[PDB]
Amino acid sequence: MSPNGNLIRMLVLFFLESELHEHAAYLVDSLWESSQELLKDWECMTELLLEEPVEEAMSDRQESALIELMVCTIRQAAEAHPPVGRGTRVLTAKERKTQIDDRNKLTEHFIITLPMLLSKYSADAEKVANLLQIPQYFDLEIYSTGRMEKHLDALLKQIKFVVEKHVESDVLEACSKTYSILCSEEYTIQNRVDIARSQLIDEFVDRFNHSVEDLLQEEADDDDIYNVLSTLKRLTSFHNAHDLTKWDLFGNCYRLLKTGIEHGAMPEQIVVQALQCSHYSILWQLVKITDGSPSKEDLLVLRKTVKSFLAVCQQCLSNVNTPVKEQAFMLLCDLLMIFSHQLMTGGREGLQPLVFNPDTGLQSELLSFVMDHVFIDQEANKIEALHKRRNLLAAFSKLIIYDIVDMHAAADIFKHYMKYYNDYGDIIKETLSKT
Numbered sequence: 274m275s276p277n278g279n280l281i282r283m284l285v286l287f288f289l290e291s292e293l294h295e296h297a298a299y300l301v302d303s304l305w306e307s308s309q310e311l312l313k314d315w316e317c318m319t320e321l322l323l324e325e326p327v328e329e330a331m332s333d334r335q336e337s338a339l340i341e342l343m344v345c346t347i348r349q350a351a352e353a354h355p356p357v358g359r360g361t362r363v364l365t366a367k368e369r370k371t372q373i374d375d376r377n378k379l380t381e382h383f384i385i386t387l388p389m390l391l392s393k394y395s396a397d398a399e400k401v402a403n404l405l406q407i408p409q410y411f412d413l414e415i416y417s418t419g420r421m422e423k424h425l426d427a428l429l430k431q432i433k434f435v436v437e438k439h440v441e442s443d444v445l446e447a448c449s450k451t452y453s454i455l456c457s458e459e460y461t462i463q464n465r466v467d468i469a470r471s472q473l474i475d476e477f478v479d480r481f482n483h484s485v486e487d488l489l490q491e492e493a494d495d496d497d498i499y500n501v502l503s504t505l506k507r508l509t510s511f512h513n514a515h516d517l518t519k520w521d522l523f524g525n526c527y528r529l530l531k532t533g534i535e536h537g538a539m540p541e542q543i544v545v546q547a548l549q550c551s552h553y554s555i556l557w558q559l560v561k562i563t564d565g566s567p568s569k570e571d572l573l574v575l576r577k578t579v580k581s582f583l584a585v586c587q588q589c590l591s592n593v594n595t596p597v598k599e600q601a602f603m604l605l606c607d608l609l610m611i612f613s614h615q616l617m618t619g620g621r622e623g624l625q626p627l628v629f630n631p632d633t634g635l636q637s638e639l640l641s642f643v644m645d646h647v648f649i650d651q652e653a654n655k656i657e658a659l660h661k662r663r664n665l666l667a668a669f670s671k672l673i674i675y676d677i678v679d680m681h682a683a684a685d686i687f688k689h690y691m692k693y694y695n696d697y698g699d700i701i702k703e704t705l706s707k708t
């Protein structure tokens with residue numbers, strides 16, 4: 274009760290104070306043979322997190338660590354295997370028996386307790402996003418079984434708060450994922466979640482729409498700009514895993530982008546999101562068209578939409594802010610690959626009118642960006658920034674393989690930049706091989 278609360282308080286301390294375990298997931302996994310009993314005392318943990326002290330309280334760091342540790346114990350119990358990175362699969366009867374029993378325990382528990390955790394920590398983005406990893410492990414059918422409808426409502430109340438309080442992409446994307454989870458994994462609860470969601474959305478589309486109108490008609494306020502971005506972010510995060518086509522978001526994003534080119538002064542993060550949102554509208558419009566049995570005009574209305582958006586992305590290469598360019602670029606290398614001739618794979622030759630081949634002028638800018646923004650001259654930010662430029666290239670590389678840009682102009686740029694490996698490589702190799 275408090276004997277395990279002593280052991281768990283000091284386990285959080287051994288994690289933080291010693292750099293002997295860098296990743297919580299690996300620490301948990303290592304103790305899991307010898308200390309399963311302790312690590313699945315979820316009541317003990319939620320207690321520590323929710324109670325008020327007698328003496329000695331928990332510090333904001335140790336609170337965070339406990340939550341991260343907790344989530345890893347929840348995962349290891351649900352999945353019944355070591356975390357990704359320590360893997361190697363077949364269970365014994367008693368192991369399989371334990372898996373079910375644990376899954377039941379944490380579900381019943383966290384259904385009750387996760388809304389309370391979210392409530393208490395509703396403004397701590399790292400913490401909130403870490404807690405919202407939990408419902409993916411739920412035995413979701415228990416929302417009927419325990420007559421537990423009361424706490425499904427409660428989680429949904431708290432998710433609605435979180436999305437209303439926050440703009441960080443980790444938190445929002447955590448909320449969206451959690452909705453998808455709660456939706457199409459049980460009919461019993463589906464209709465209930467569907468409503469809280471499409472209300473959540475409605476309240477944000479109306480807010481965004483008024484903000485979009487506010488911004489464009491106005492000289493524009495720091496608020497008019499806050500309002501557009503803040504709402505758009507929420508909707509874009511969600512638009513990835515949720516089909517928001519019924520609200521014509523593409524139209525207003527398209528205006529926002531058009532204003533940013535025309536008059537040249539749209540704030541960078543509005544432009545980036547406006548793009549990403551538009552792209553997700555386009556993917557989802559496509560998906561309904563593949564799976565449906567679409568007409569001549571259906572295709573042609575999507576075509577006009579796609580060509581207007583490829584145009585915007587191209588023009589957005591010329592935006593001063595390099596984040597915009599990379600987004601613009603990313604979407605070009607996605608879309609030119611998506612609406613390539615591979616769109617007539619799998620007996621889908623109805624889709625010919627949706628195919629696009631990029632023009633010379635465009636291809637020359639898709640080459641330009643690589644010389645300008647993959648291949649560049651000069652802590653933690655740079656190992657990260659590199660993997661992105663890697664991705665930008667790998668995304669461009671796909672276009673080159675299937676001859677969607679000029680493969681020869683590309684490899685000429687690869688020549689120009691690999692020069693010193695081809696002029697002095699052997700020499701640098703054998704030198705380094707004797708030291």
Ligand SMILES: CCNc1ccc(C)nn1
Binds near residue numbers: 494496497
């Ligand atoms: C037209 C409404 N927008 C405004 C005005 C003034 C301030 C400070 N903020 N926002």
